[PDB]
Amino acid sequence: VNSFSGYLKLTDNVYIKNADIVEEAKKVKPTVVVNAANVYLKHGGGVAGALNKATNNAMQVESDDYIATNGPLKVGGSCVLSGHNLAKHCLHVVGPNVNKGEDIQLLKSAYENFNQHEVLLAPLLSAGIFGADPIHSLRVCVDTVRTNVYLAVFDKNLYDKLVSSFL
């Protein structure tokens, strides 16, 4: 038993809810919250900027030190950093940004990072301002992630469409 509440069951291990991921992280304090990161860990906008804003920019400060030491991530890759006030850990995962011209085939590799964690709170990778179709992202998630993933969908109308179109 875990502390996630009101999630809709898609598969044995994947649940989904219409939720603001910042508010959800604050309430649950999950072991792992997933950030929709870019390779530079520049959290200007999107989920990245939203989670970073909720940490009072401490996520960005930690991230800049990480990049200065290690260099950029790979598209499809990830790193584990602090979850600050939102979670124990933040798994920064880089899904391909379609609007930047990046290769959408890399979405499966991005979701494979989730399998290194038993339970995660996460957004739909590559969706929103990353430019991929969210229906596709959900399909890749379900077909790739084997650990327990709680998907927080911000957009109410999208949430309804994702549930009603799920095979």
Ligand SMILES: Cn1ccn2c(CCNC(=O)[C@H]3C[C@H]3C(=O)O)nnc2c1=O
């Ligand atoms: C406080 N907060 C919370 C969330 N948020 C977002 C989420 C952005 N959309 C996505 O990640 C797309 C997958 C689809 C969705 O989940 O609706 N953008 N800005 C914020 C923000 O300020």
